[model samples]
Target: FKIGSVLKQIRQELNYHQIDLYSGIMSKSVYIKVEADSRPISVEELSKFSERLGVNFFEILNRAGMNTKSVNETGKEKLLISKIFTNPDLFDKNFQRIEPKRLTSLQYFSIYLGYISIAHHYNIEVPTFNKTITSDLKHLYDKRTTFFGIDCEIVSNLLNVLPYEEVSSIIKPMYPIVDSFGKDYDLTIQTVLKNALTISIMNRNLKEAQYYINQFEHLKTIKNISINGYYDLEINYLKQIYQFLTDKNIDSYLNAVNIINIFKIIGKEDIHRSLVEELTKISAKEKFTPPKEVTMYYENYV
Candidate 1:
């Protein structure tokens, strides 16, 4: 609340001497103190001053940064993301937002540490807030609420904000939530699996990463999309990633140049721009390794 600024604006509008402005309200000194925000103004005192200025008390309070009106879930969601990516002022000491009980699923995601989604949409410094956002996405898994098409993107974005040290704990659980829900993601389960597998590889969570290597087997279980070269690029890319992670030999990653070119031909950014960063940097001028079983795989599938 910019108390002093509001007081000055209203004081000028009502046209009164600073001393006379108090009239019968409070001691002139206290009113001046409240204007400076140096003293707390009781609701009664604030109300009296509000009436004197011909303003609703809550209106002035709102202008002073108190959310007097109830904010719908989206507003809280926006502010929480804002808090993580931009403003540190949104949450006070209690971590209390304007309206508590009304938040619903947005509340669970509120304290979640993932902010990559927020970063993409807004240009702001990473804020330093005392509150921590957790990995729990149970709200997103509720049978009625899927986040529909946006769920995968939402989950994928969280991959960015998670710290390398803490990622396993946060991400390990979401696979089940995603496995159990969301219509849009269920339809493109391969892409979701592919993205998650890629992150597991990046974080070097090889045990988890290795589990997703059988992209063919997983996609076969669902009536997932085989759109365009979607399956071609996604599954083949994961195989390359899996091989790269397991082999520990730089030569094996030479195939990445060809794989990346394949992805470029197919026209989709692998979930993480940096997904192929390491693979792209290793020099392979002598030769670029291409996919294994290329003819058989494509002929049988694509």
Candidate 2:
């Protein structure tokens, strides 16, 4: 069966209106095209629809003549090709190709160095963090801060007051610190910095935090943030942190992105890369990357 016919059968089996299924899962126009076989099914979109319909995504693929009997049998070669075509944004569109060489080489050097340092510190076997290492070192480019005195309250208040400037000043300096450290120390210091920042911000002004909470109430109903990308371990850690803050009634000043990124960075390379790939695809479709203006605003507090 063709993808269109399979989609039609699934729609009928679920007894859902085209508009109804499309409302939460996809656009109405795309639904029509899928039913008519005028356009091909994108793996991402198909996975989403299959999830919404409570069906196995591979089952849909099987119906569409694209199934592999064993999931492992489909190698990265085929998977990467499908991912590239379905989500061209995975490659830098301007360059029109996946620059895997540059990404892979940098990952080998930087990531392996981090792993070696961690191994040496604990006198353990080397390459301990290899499974979690990435071929794409773009994450190394993220802005970090290191000044121990720069408290979270100050950062929080800065974000509250300024709310829109790019605070590269705060993050740029931290990059070197992160670069200089071993993996274990690097991760430990970052966790400390993030917690300190969170605490400082929450303790700054109760009234200001209350105001921000009210603002969030209005926006939460309109916008949805995906939380599934977070790692279970990181999510559990954040939950503990949130519990602490909530008990103190200090949750008002917390930054969601700070928690999200911290959680995301803990995953394996495959997991991290998948998240980045999905994010790239989403950005391409939506034509925007959510600005970090709020975080940068914290720089003004300095």
Candidate 3:
């Protein structure tokens, strides 16, 4: 967002007309579009253009308020994060291809967060990256902190791996800050509480689980928030777990089975399988036997 403004300012300071600077590199129309943020610039394009403009490539990214080592790296990092929940193997594969040395400090922190998430998914051990966490990065998770855009992603990933107590502390303080100033961070708050709800249920933290559910219900009262169907199903699934675990409600457990069926019908088999596996793990932990209907549904129908 800031890149176009920074580029325009730099070009003006150098006293170069758009046509003069873009003559060989791009069309005048494209240059104008880039300046207006209507066009995207790749890392390679900026590196080459920086040489022509006599500015350092990294300097432009810095002035633009982009923390990634390069603009393209920002997109790649987001891609890594997007695939992590849906397809962790693909995330790991792409993640391994990038050398850590190429990343800026925050960029590395984001990817390492990705590693912890994937490790948790597969029950693998995360490496010693925790010892290397910079205070600057940790500071972002402090009490009452308003998160930057990237910090939202980092905090969401942290919810996946950190202990329930630790994550609760981070989330508790940010609740009001998000409510007041972070209207754009609604999705991040929802995601964090979703993970928090699951962890609370798993750990038998009944009060925390109810608090998270109350937060989700409150989000529905906000205008312009598209409470999509997927999240609806997820909230229901967690509720079912909470009900069955806390109150021994067999019907709630059965409803959870039907929820996973909806995921499959909607061509979200990945989520269906993941939810089924999660329920299986939870059942094992409690040593609770499923009703015959629930058992047959998985063995025959699922």
Candidate 4:
């Protein structure tokens, strides 16, 4: 059955009204259609909705016949290997290309597994990276009043040094943390951070490195952070960043002042100065907090 049909059944069983389901998260319209299967749920949106509903997402995926074990097992691996041999550069070429819907389930699964393997091999603390990136990005977007710009480039640099195929692997885990930030907290932080990390990773520039590290330092002082409203603004920013980077559209500057207003609302001056100092220190010498080897498993796996 489609996810919407399953969700509708579950909602009926739970006797939860659409408005009730959306009370703490999302809109009534979105909640209604999400259950009705009228809307295609993005991975990110599905995850957030599931969390708010207090449901186990894996179970839902299983019910939908999309469980990792069933669909992404050894047989699939062999099939992928054969496909790779037939087109040696398939994966690499696809990475260079941007057909979002064209990626097969097996190809996406292979990339995810490869990332997990590398994370295990290097002993990278995926959760810590998530927290670090989330905290850093929130500070940059919320405090700096900058929507999508050089600051993102800094965070992306750190991700590049790590071995991973897709940016979502890094960004997905942190969604819970970032999404918790209230609407007043600018969502642009996430988009900017995501874009910056993607660019930094692809370019591998030393000068642009240290964005997240610096942002983390600033976040350490804040007691807590929250996003204030729906993330439509942030989503728009991400789309804008993608277009700017891919199409070289300079119109992004048109929204600069409004973006800056967001930062001002969140208290940008102090955070900006602090970030600059931290960035300067990082540029002068290679120093990073929460050493790369520290395992995030203590928190994530449990």
Candidate 5:
């Protein structure tokens, strides 16, 4: 079935003129052929066209009887993704239902690394999927193969657990994929850079950390419509933490605490709780006390 026909039907029902619907998105001649089912519309074009028509892209895809579960399953994956950081118990229980065979490499990497991150975060024992997945990923990286969005994800998650040298080969190569995908891959690429930033900071590799931080900060200058407030808060908080770690600066710690408080005020309790635990650990390690104002909250939680 032609998705173009489904889109055409939607456009006509909405009383949208062909030129108006496709204006600035595609040429009039190309759009005419698309609507006539003589030319195909790519997913990227379809997404933009649907937005112009004020409809969901998946609705058009589903109406055309294309595989819609890819989109729907993405919705399903979000919970496990969320669980990676928020609730390990829920992630543990639901992780069993995952069928890796049915998943694309991207989906598999997402869930596999998600579970690994959850385990690392919560101190839960990891299940035995690492060897196979690791070998396959290494094989890809070894061959100097180009990576896609998922491969970017695979490398990002690997950075969290794998040795820096083992994963370093593919890291720079993944930059182009991240750059090319822009907003579509912003969060994923951000995570990649975030992981690298954390590692570099932890290793006291200031130059490397600065490089990732610069890359991460440069993302703001891009034409991303999907500005993530949480990430902004996160990056702001991390910058302060970085400052504190590098300079033994107490003010940076206070600033970090202040930003984290906003997470609490905004009812991001899980993240708030997690951030507190994380900061507390860092405070203890550095032998610096957070002020009573912040410790008061930590005391209540502890």
Candidate 6:
């Protein structure tokens, strides 16, 4: 139940006794203190069992913290968007406009989408959200570690913009940030590299896409970025989209196939209906004829 006991539970799940899990590195009595919650597991102590447990050490960081959402979902067709413009406390961490604070990443991501929400609700671009992220842009480009390392939840909504130039500056700078690392891999770097890959696909930039792809493989060689499902959907779909957009091996079109469902899953659809509508178009079908512009036949006969 306790964070220290989590490793013990995993060790037990593997059907090994505490002493059995060790290979002369740590004594059984010492490990007992770790299990007993008397001492927290050191980074050094945690890795010894990684191979036996079949997991990356990064996967376990903050695993003890409860999973929390900044906003409550209505559970209806759409998720309730956080109207952060009204509340700077929830949005601003450095300024400390309020007593209780929210996660900076959560705050910014929510604010970013709130821009989309304001746009969709009022049918006008939200100057606040755009300004917020753009103003915060300098800190991120300098590898400021903008948010928590695992804050991949907001990526798709952040990327779901038109022309792709809007985020070219934010996404492009991640290259040098991620490339600047070796052996010391921060989860934020993976988030950046992954976001860069998606941005490349969205813009149809083949040369840039290949650069990120190569970079990701090289990163994998240096560090095991075993981020949990917080990032799973983004990673998987970005891969699927990149394949559809670039590979061209299949005759089918790229679509989310219950995209609204996926949108709801990610707490999207808060953006205006018109702006969000094109995503639905992505899901439907069409045949091959690359340069020629093929027609999409939905029904039995064309």
Candidate maximizing lDDT: 5
Q: What tens digits encode model 6's per-residue C-alpha lDDT throughout 128-227?
A: 4455555554444446444333233344345554335665555543444333332224455666566667567555676777776666656555434444
TM-scores for candidates 1 onward, in order: 0.43, 0.23, 0.60, 0.25, 0.66, 0.43
Q: Write candidate 4's Cα lDDT for 1-302 as tens digits.
A: 36777666666777766665567566788877777778777777667656755677767766666643336444454355345444544544532332222124423433433433344445544453444434543433344432232223333443444433334334433322322233224333444444443344234442332353233333334445433232334333334433444444557523422442354467664432322332223323333332121122112323
Model 6 Cα displacement at 173 (Å)?
3.2
RMSD of 1: 16.7
CA lDDT, candidate 6, residue 164: 55
Task: Give the C-alpha lDDT of model 1.
Answer: 0.52
How much does candidate 4 score in TM-score?
0.25
Per-residue CA lDDT of candidate 3, range 42-130, in tens?
77767766777799887888788765534676566656665666766665465565435323654556677776667777775545445
Alpha carbon lDDT at 203, candidate 4: 48
Count clashing residue pairs in model 6.
Answer: 3
**lDDT accuracy of residue 219 in candidate 2:** 26
Compared to the true structure, candidate 3 yields what TM-score?
Answer: 0.60
Q: Note each model's CA RMSD in angstroms.
A: 16.7, 19.2, 9.9, 17.9, 6.1, 9.6
Report, for all candidates in order, the number of backbone clashes.
5, 5, 0, 12, 0, 3
By summed lDDT, the worst window of 10 consecutive residues in model 1 runs over: 129-138
Ranking by lDDT: 5, 3, 1, 6, 4, 2
Q: Which stretches of model 4 miss by more than 4 angstroms?
A: 68-302
Cα-lDDT of candidate 6: 0.49
Tell how far residue 216 is off in model 6, in angstroms. 9.9
Task: Report how far residue 270 has shifted in candidate 5, in Å.
Answer: 3.0
TM-score quality measure for candidate 6: 0.43
- Highest-TM-score candidate: 5
Model 2 spans > 4 angstroms off? 68-302
Q: Which candidate, 1 or 5, has the higher TM-score?
A: 5
Name the regions of candidate 5 deviating beyond 4 angstroms: 1-9, 16-106, 115-134, 163-165, 176-182, 202-207, 223-227, 299-302
Q: List the residue pairs that clash in candidate 6.
A: 120-272, 255-282, 255-283
